[PDB]
């Protein structure tokens, strides 16, 4: 029993952080066999003019307490690339993937190429993440394990003026509609995670908390129209089959499920709480919720 | 910006994983440097569970009914221990991922990060509270005992706790890494239960430090309180009492936002008594009290 946000376990992803420094500015790497992965704006913009003036020697890459030395440099999109003379041994088997909104994640925090933190989150419909980052957190990678596949889904780059944060996947393609420069960036209104509200109430039902149920079914369009009147998500076809094994687990259809959050939307929580808390959580997606409820290991 | 529950880094921790059987039964041990730790419950069966003597059915057993697996080789059992709740397992082989350890007992209400394991393979990572009843509030299912509590200050690792027993209520008991066990419980399957849990006041309070720290204020009030007339409304709603040592702990937050600890208090007080009125703190709609002072600091500072 218990219900916790859990990150998967962070030691493949520790073993792959590096300190990258350029002039005064010191971030975090993701040194994956040679090569060395950080956010273009170390070097900080037109940045094919600040990189071509750049030299091997003006990159320090460091990896504990060992130097390493760059042998070239280039840029992908918003991430710079620095080919080391040494491949990390403690490469893991990994993959770089685009996650979409919705889809959740593990995020290594790291500071001076050091982790500090392990958290899990969800990358939210308007493309932003909720973390917890402070200056020098730039670099920071999240990411998802399964088997022994680490797939890198993202890498920090900023912090916009809500707190919230923005930043890219590996191939350095931003989420949502964000610069890597210092100019006036806002993220757009938020929405719930339909799909992962749905999943938490099945979590919630495997755990012993059934007081949000009830006899009432809904069709996917009344439910939809109710989705939209409060900045919920539109719920798919995709989702009900993807909640299906859930479903069947506990013996409540997607559809009746789904009764009950409209129900929960229009007439609040009512002094309970659901799983110890008293919001609809939306950060565990159907994958998540499995996976936790049943043991699967790394 | 930002405040999320954080855990620490596992990575340290997932190279001591092991998994340790004994007859039928299958759980998770801490491989450090010669040493395998794990619950001493293993030699029993379920049979056994209601009434153990753990010095009686230890003594029937030999090296070589204990199977030791660290991934996929089989280390050898040379010698065995019992330390209270706890069965030390002494190996041919040490730890080469040892990390610098240490073993730590906690007291109610402080934090750490709890490794889940099953066959000696690591599965997530969450943050957690030793509640003031002694138990915590896990995720855990059959085959996690052994997991282990730790924290990581600096490069050392302390250990504070290894998984048990899932209590009644769906909350979970467990030892220090000396077998020692944290509150009034026992491991055997006679009927126990854990005492009424309350809130842990000192980390509600630095909770509200960090939502001032990141621009939060619509709690804070013109209001200040006496600590005796704190304590006797906050254990109406059945939050621990808040001690004189709680006040100076909290000390290095009230300097850093202005706004005194008895200040604080009487912000407490008003949203114990009004709720929250639609509004959250931090992204959260209840009072959280699984972040302490320290961990406040940390997170916010560095
Ligand atoms: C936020 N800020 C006013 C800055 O000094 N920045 C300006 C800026 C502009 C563009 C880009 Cl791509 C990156 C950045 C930097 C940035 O966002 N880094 C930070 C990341 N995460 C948490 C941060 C908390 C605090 C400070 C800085 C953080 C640095
Ligand atoms: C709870 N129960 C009737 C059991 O199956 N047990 C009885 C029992 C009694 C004493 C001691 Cl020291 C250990 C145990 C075992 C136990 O608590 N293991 C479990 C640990 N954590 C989460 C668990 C979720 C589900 C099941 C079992 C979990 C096994
Ligand atoms: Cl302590």
Same mark, same amino acid.
């Given at each position: 029993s218990g219900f916790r946000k859990m990150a998967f376990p962070s030691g493949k992803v520790e073993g792959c952080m590096v300190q990258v420094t350029c002039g005064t500015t010191t971030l975090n790497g993701l040194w994956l066999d040679d090569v060395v992965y950080c /956010?273009?704006?170390?070097?900080? /913009?037109?940045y094919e003019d600040l990189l071509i003036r750049k030299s091997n020697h003006n990159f320090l890459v460091q990896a504990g307490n060992v130097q390493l030395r760059v042998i070239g440099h280039s840029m992908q999109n918003c991430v710079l690339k620095l080919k080391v003379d040494t491949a990390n041994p403690k490469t893991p088997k990994y993959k770089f993937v685009r996650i979409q909104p919705g889809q959740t994640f593990s995020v290594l925090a790291c500071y001076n190429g050091s982790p500090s933190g392990v958290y899990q989150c969800a990358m939210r419909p308007n493309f932003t993440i909720k973390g917890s980052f402070l200056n020098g957190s730039c670099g920071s990678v999240g990411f998802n394990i399964d088997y022994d596949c680490v797939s890198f889904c993202y890498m920090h780059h900023m912090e916009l003026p809500t707190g919230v944060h923005a930043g890219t996947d590996l191939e350095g393609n931003f989420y949502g509609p964000f610069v890597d420069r210092q100019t006036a960036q806002a993220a757009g209104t938020d929405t719930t995670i339909t799909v992962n509200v749905l999943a938490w109430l099945y979590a919630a039902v495997i755990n012993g908390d059934r007081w949000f149920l009830n006899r009432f079914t809904t069709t996917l369009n009344d439910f939809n129209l109710v989705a939209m009147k409060y900045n919920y998500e539109p719920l798919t076809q995709d989702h009900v089959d993807i909640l299906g094994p859930l479903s069947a687990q506990t013996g409540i259809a997607v559809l009746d499920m789904c009764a009950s959050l409209k129900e929960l939307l229009q007439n609040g929580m009512n002094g309970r709480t659901i799983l110890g808390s008293a919001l609809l959580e939306d950060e565990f997606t159907p994958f998540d919720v499995v996976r936790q409820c049943s043991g699967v290991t790394f």
């Amino acid at each position: 029993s218990g219900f916790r946000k859990m990150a998967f376990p962070s030691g493949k992803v520790e073993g792959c952080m590096v300190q990258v420094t350029c002039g005064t500015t010191t971030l975090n790497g993701l040194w994956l066999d040679d090569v060395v992965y950080c /956010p273009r704006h170390v070097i900080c /913009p037109n940045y094919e003019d600040l990189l071509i003036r750049k030299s091997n020697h003006n990159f320090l890459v460091q990896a504990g307490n060992v130097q390493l030395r760059v042998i070239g440099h280039s840029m992908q999109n918003c991430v710079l690339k620095l080919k080391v003379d040494t491949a990390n041994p403690k490469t893991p088997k990994y993959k770089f993937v685009r996650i979409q909104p919705g889809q959740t994640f593990s995020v290594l925090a790291c500071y001076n190429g050091s982790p500090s933190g392990v958290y899990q989150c969800a990358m939210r419909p308007n493309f932003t993440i909720k973390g917890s980052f402070l200056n020098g957190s730039c670099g920071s990678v999240g990411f998802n394990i399964d088997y022994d596949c680490v797939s890198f889904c993202y890498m920090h780059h900023m912090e916009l003026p809500t707190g919230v944060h923005a930043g890219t996947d590996l191939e350095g393609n931003f989420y949502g509609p964000f610069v890597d420069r210092q100019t006036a960036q806002a993220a757009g209104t938020d929405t719930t995670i339909t799909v992962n509200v749905l999943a938490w109430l099945y979590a919630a039902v495997i755990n012993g908390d059934r007081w949000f149920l009830n006899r009432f079914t809904t069709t996917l369009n009344d439910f939809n129209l109710v989705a939209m009147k409060y900045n919920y998500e539109p719920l798919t076809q995709d989702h009900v089959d993807i909640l299906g094994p859930l479903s069947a687990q506990t013996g409540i259809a997607v559809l009746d499920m789904c009764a009950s959050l409209k129900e929960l939307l229009q007439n609040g929580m009512n002094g309970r709480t659901i799983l110890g808390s008293a919001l609809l959580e939306d950060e565990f997606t159907p994958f998540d919720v499995v996976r936790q409820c049943s043991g699967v290991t790394f």
